[PDB]
Short mmCIF file of C-alpha atoms in Angstrom, two decimals:
data_model
loop_
_atom_site.label_atom_id
_atom_site.label_comp_id
_atom_site.label_asym_id
_atom_site.label_seq_id
_atom_site.Cartn_x
_atom_site.Cartn_y
_atom_site.Cartn_z
CA UNK A 1 -6.21 7.24 -20.42
CA UNK A 2 -2.72 7.94 -21.70
CA UNK A 3 0.10 6.77 -23.95
CA UNK A 4 3.31 7.69 -22.02
CA UNK A 5 5.88 4.96 -21.23
CA UNK A 6 4.43 4.18 -17.72
CA UNK A 7 0.85 3.75 -18.86
CA UNK A 8 0.47 -0.04 -18.32
CA UNK A 9 1.96 -0.05 -14.84
CA UNK A 10 -0.22 2.95 -13.87
CA UNK A 11 -3.31 0.99 -14.88
CA UNK A 12 -2.08 -2.12 -13.15
CA UNK A 13 -1.36 -0.25 -9.90
CA UNK A 14 -4.74 1.52 -10.19
CA UNK A 15 -6.49 -1.78 -10.79
CA UNK A 16 -4.76 -3.57 -7.93
CA UNK A 17 -5.87 -0.73 -5.59
CA UNK A 18 -9.49 -0.78 -6.92
CA UNK A 19 -9.61 -4.58 -6.41
CA UNK A 20 -7.52 -5.09 -3.15
CA UNK A 21 -7.35 -1.76 -1.25
CA UNK A 22 -11.10 -1.23 -1.04
CA UNK A 23 -11.70 -4.55 0.78
CA UNK A 24 -13.09 -4.04 4.31
CA UNK A 25 -10.42 -4.72 6.98
CA UNK A 26 -10.40 -4.99 10.79
CA UNK A 27 -13.50 -7.05 10.23
CA UNK A 28 -10.36 -8.90 9.01
CA UNK A 29 -8.28 -10.59 11.67
CA UNK A 30 -4.89 -10.06 10.09
CA UNK A 31 -5.33 -6.31 10.39
CA UNK A 32 -5.53 -4.30 13.56
CA UNK A 33 -7.18 -1.00 14.33
CA UNK A 34 -4.32 0.93 15.86
CA UNK A 35 -5.73 4.51 15.88
CA UNK A 36 -9.23 6.05 15.91
CA UNK A 37 -10.23 9.68 16.01
CA UNK A 38 -13.54 11.12 14.98
CA UNK A 39 -14.28 9.42 11.67
CA UNK A 40 -10.72 8.33 11.03
CA UNK A 41 -9.81 4.67 11.62
CA UNK A 42 -6.16 3.67 11.04
CA UNK A 43 -5.41 -0.02 10.56
CA UNK A 44 -2.10 -1.86 10.34
CA UNK A 45 -1.10 -5.38 9.28
CA UNK A 46 2.17 -6.50 10.89
CA UNK A 47 4.79 -7.84 8.48
CA UNK A 48 8.52 -8.13 8.04
CA UNK A 49 10.43 -9.62 5.13
CA UNK A 50 14.05 -10.64 5.76
CA UNK A 51 14.12 -8.81 9.08
CA UNK A 52 12.68 -5.59 7.62
CA UNK A 53 9.40 -3.84 8.74
CA UNK A 54 6.94 -3.51 5.81
CA UNK A 55 3.64 -3.19 7.78
CA UNK A 56 0.96 -2.31 5.21
CA UNK A 57 -1.13 0.60 6.52
CA UNK A 58 -4.75 1.27 5.70
CA UNK A 59 -6.95 4.17 6.84
CA UNK A 60 -10.61 4.99 6.34
CA UNK A 61 -12.16 8.39 6.81
CA UNK A 62 -15.42 10.25 6.15
CA UNK A 63 -15.22 13.99 5.41
CA UNK A 64 -18.36 16.11 5.22
CA UNK A 65 -18.80 18.81 2.56
CA UNK A 66 -16.01 17.95 0.11
CA UNK A 67 -15.89 15.72 -2.95
CA UNK A 68 -13.42 12.95 -3.98
CA UNK A 69 -12.31 15.16 -6.89
CA UNK A 70 -11.50 17.99 -4.53
CA UNK A 71 -9.65 15.67 -2.10
CA UNK A 72 -7.65 14.02 -4.90
CA UNK A 73 -6.82 17.38 -6.57
CA UNK A 74 -5.34 18.78 -3.35
CA UNK A 75 -3.39 15.61 -2.51
CA UNK A 76 -1.95 15.33 -6.07
CA UNK A 77 -1.53 19.03 -6.84
CA UNK A 78 2.17 19.90 -6.42
CA UNK A 79 1.31 23.66 -6.56
CA UNK A 80 -0.37 23.37 -3.11
CA UNK A 81 1.94 20.86 -1.32
CA UNK A 82 3.73 23.20 1.11
CA UNK A 83 0.37 24.15 2.71
CA UNK A 84 -0.38 20.77 4.18
CA UNK A 85 2.79 18.65 3.90
CA UNK A 86 4.96 18.60 7.03
CA UNK A 87 7.49 15.74 6.57
CA UNK A 88 9.10 16.98 3.35
CA UNK A 89 12.58 18.64 3.29
CA UNK A 90 12.57 19.38 -0.46
CA UNK A 91 11.07 18.04 -3.71
CA UNK A 92 10.75 18.68 -7.40
CA UNK A 93 8.95 17.44 -10.49
CA UNK A 94 11.53 15.37 -12.42
CA UNK A 95 9.33 14.93 -15.46
CA UNK A 96 5.83 15.52 -16.65
CA UNK A 97 4.47 12.40 -18.32
CA UNK A 98 0.95 13.76 -18.81
CA UNK A 99 -1.55 16.30 -17.53
CA UNK A 100 -2.52 13.86 -14.74
CA UNK A 101 0.96 12.17 -14.28
CA UNK A 102 4.30 13.39 -12.95
CA UNK A 103 7.50 11.94 -11.44
CA UNK A 104 8.54 13.58 -8.18
CA UNK A 105 11.83 13.47 -6.40
CA UNK A 106 11.74 14.36 -2.73
CA UNK A 107 13.71 14.27 0.46
CA UNK A 108 12.16 13.91 3.87
CA UNK A 109 12.93 15.48 7.23
CA UNK A 110 15.14 13.51 9.61
CA UNK A 111 13.21 10.98 11.66
CA UNK A 112 15.60 9.46 14.22
CA UNK A 113 17.27 6.93 14.33
CA UNK A 114 18.02 7.50 10.63
CA UNK A 115 19.64 9.73 8.02
CA UNK A 116 17.20 11.08 5.46
CA UNK A 117 15.17 8.93 3.15
CA UNK A 118 14.65 10.11 -0.33
CA UNK A 119 11.94 8.86 -2.62
CA UNK A 120 11.45 8.93 -6.34
CA UNK A 121 7.88 8.22 -7.48
CA UNK A 122 5.28 8.45 -10.16
CA UNK A 123 2.23 10.40 -8.95
CA UNK A 124 -0.95 10.04 -10.99
CA UNK A 125 -4.50 11.32 -10.55
CA UNK A 126 -7.31 9.24 -12.13
CA UNK A 127 -11.09 9.18 -12.31
CA UNK A 128 -12.54 5.69 -12.41
CA UNK A 129 -16.04 5.87 -13.98
CA UNK A 130 -18.98 4.27 -12.20
CA UNK A 131 -20.18 1.05 -13.90
CA UNK A 132 -23.69 2.42 -13.41
CA UNK A 133 -25.20 5.75 -12.40
CA UNK A 134 -26.43 3.72 -9.39
CA UNK A 135 -22.80 3.72 -8.11
CA UNK A 136 -20.22 6.27 -6.97
CA UNK A 137 -17.37 7.36 -9.26
CA UNK A 138 -13.94 6.94 -7.76
CA UNK A 139 -11.09 9.36 -7.78
CA UNK A 140 -7.65 7.94 -6.98
CA UNK A 141 -4.14 9.38 -6.59
CA UNK A 142 -1.50 6.61 -6.97
CA UNK A 143 2.03 7.33 -5.76
CA UNK A 144 4.48 4.51 -6.51
CA UNK A 145 8.23 4.24 -6.80
CA UNK A 146 9.81 4.34 -10.25
CA UNK A 147 13.37 4.68 -11.62
CA UNK A 148 14.55 7.70 -13.53
CA UNK A 149 18.03 8.28 -14.98
CA UNK A 150 18.06 11.86 -13.77
CA UNK A 151 17.61 10.51 -10.25
CA UNK A 152 20.21 7.82 -9.39
CA UNK A 153 20.63 6.50 -5.86
CA UNK A 154 22.82 9.04 -4.10
CA UNK A 155 24.98 8.33 -1.06
CA UNK A 156 23.42 11.12 1.04
CA UNK A 157 19.97 9.53 1.30
CA UNK A 158 18.40 6.12 1.84
CA UNK A 159 16.00 5.32 -1.04
CA UNK A 160 12.51 4.36 0.27
CA UNK A 161 10.23 2.30 -1.98
CA UNK A 162 6.54 3.37 -1.79
CA UNK A 163 3.18 2.27 -3.05
CA UNK A 164 0.55 4.73 -1.77
CA UNK A 165 -3.09 5.37 -2.83
CA UNK A 166 -5.67 7.95 -1.73
CA UNK A 167 -9.02 6.59 -2.90
CA UNK A 168 -12.14 8.76 -2.71
CA UNK A 169 -15.83 8.28 -3.41
CA UNK A 170 -18.39 11.04 -3.05
CA UNK A 171 -21.85 10.34 -1.60
CA UNK A 172 -24.38 13.05 -2.46
CA UNK A 173 -27.79 13.42 -0.83
CA UNK A 174 -30.82 15.53 -1.85
CA UNK A 175 -31.94 18.52 -3.65
CA UNK A 176 -34.31 19.07 -0.67
CA UNK A 177 -37.45 20.82 -2.00
CA UNK A 178 -36.90 20.26 -4.85
CA UNK A 179 -34.39 23.16 -4.38
CA UNK A 180 -30.51 22.83 -4.61
CA UNK A 181 -27.41 20.83 -3.50
CA UNK A 182 -25.01 22.50 -1.02
CA UNK A 183 -21.88 21.20 0.76
CA UNK A 184 -24.39 19.93 3.33
CA UNK A 185 -25.60 17.23 1.03
CA UNK A 186 -22.12 15.74 0.35
CA UNK A 187 -19.68 13.39 2.08
CA UNK A 188 -16.31 12.11 0.78
CA UNK A 189 -15.50 8.49 1.76
CA UNK A 190 -11.74 8.16 1.88
CA UNK A 191 -9.59 5.02 1.79
CA UNK A 192 -5.88 5.73 2.09
CA UNK A 193 -3.33 2.89 1.71
CA UNK A 194 0.47 2.98 2.32
CA UNK A 195 3.04 0.25 1.58
CA UNK A 196 6.48 1.68 2.29
CA UNK A 197 9.91 0.07 2.38
CA UNK A 198 12.12 2.48 4.42
CA UNK A 199 15.13 0.88 2.64
CA UNK A 200 17.75 0.69 5.43
CA UNK A 201 17.43 -0.48 9.07
CA UNK A 202 15.87 0.88 12.26
CA UNK A 203 14.42 -0.82 15.37
CA UNK A 204 10.99 -2.39 14.61
CA UNK A 205 9.64 -0.77 17.77
CA UNK A 206 10.30 2.88 16.89
CA UNK A 207 9.36 2.46 13.21
CA UNK A 208 5.94 1.22 14.31
CA UNK A 209 5.67 4.08 16.85
CA UNK A 210 6.58 6.74 14.29
CA UNK A 211 4.03 5.38 11.72
CA UNK A 212 1.29 5.27 14.39
CA UNK A 213 1.74 9.07 14.96
CA UNK A 214 2.67 10.34 11.49
CA UNK A 215 -0.15 8.77 9.45
CA UNK A 216 -3.12 9.90 11.64
CA UNK A 217 -1.48 13.31 11.94
CA UNK A 218 -1.05 13.58 8.16
CA UNK A 219 -4.67 12.44 7.52
CA UNK A 220 -6.25 14.92 9.92
CA UNK A 221 -4.17 17.86 8.78
CA UNK A 222 -4.67 17.08 5.08
CA UNK A 223 -8.41 16.47 5.26
CA UNK A 224 -9.16 19.47 7.49
CA UNK A 225 -7.08 21.55 5.10
CA UNK A 226 -9.30 20.41 2.20
CA UNK A 227 -12.35 21.40 4.24
CA UNK A 228 -11.20 24.99 4.77
CA UNK A 229 -9.88 25.45 1.26
CA UNK A 230 -13.27 24.55 -0.18
CA UNK A 231 -15.64 26.06 2.46
CA UNK A 232 -18.10 28.46 0.88
CA UNK A 233 -17.06 27.70 -2.69
CA UNK A 234 -18.88 26.06 -5.60
CA UNK A 235 -18.59 22.29 -5.48
CA UNK A 236 -16.10 20.64 -7.84
CA UNK A 237 -17.62 17.23 -8.48
#
């Protein structure tokens, strides 16, 4: 756990996610289940602040034969982004803060009725130890908006403000024999949270319709991509 300038806000974001984002929803009446497919359940909570659509999004998923480490590596790892990411025009790493922490500038593809959004965020990958060996360890990627002098607001893009987490816990079953653990004995439990301010204005109706398609589509592509990248390979726990 680091010493760079953003260390305290990383830990605070991480801690808020550990404490708030893992809460069971839908069994919660302020959230609604808006999409389901296989093991993926996408929930939304409807909110605007000063006329603007901020709808927190939360998704759960269960993915056989991958670990939380593997899922978080692929989500965080900038080297492999082009392979699964579909909504990104361009991007670059603005600064490396640590081995597990970078600041990324990116522009998105044009989703009507809007010019492009850009986003400027700190992306960190963390392992949260289990309090006991009776519990799962958690891997988390936290992506949250920060400022950087090398990346001022420009007049070509609308600056979105994001707070996103991909939170993964790995359930492992049995050496069956005793014998040996394969990808058959493992399941990654995923919680993915997104709190995005688009930063301009668009009709509430289309913004909710675009989110309803884009998030499930992203989650299914990304997770099935992790499955095929890891199939037949030694397990990275």
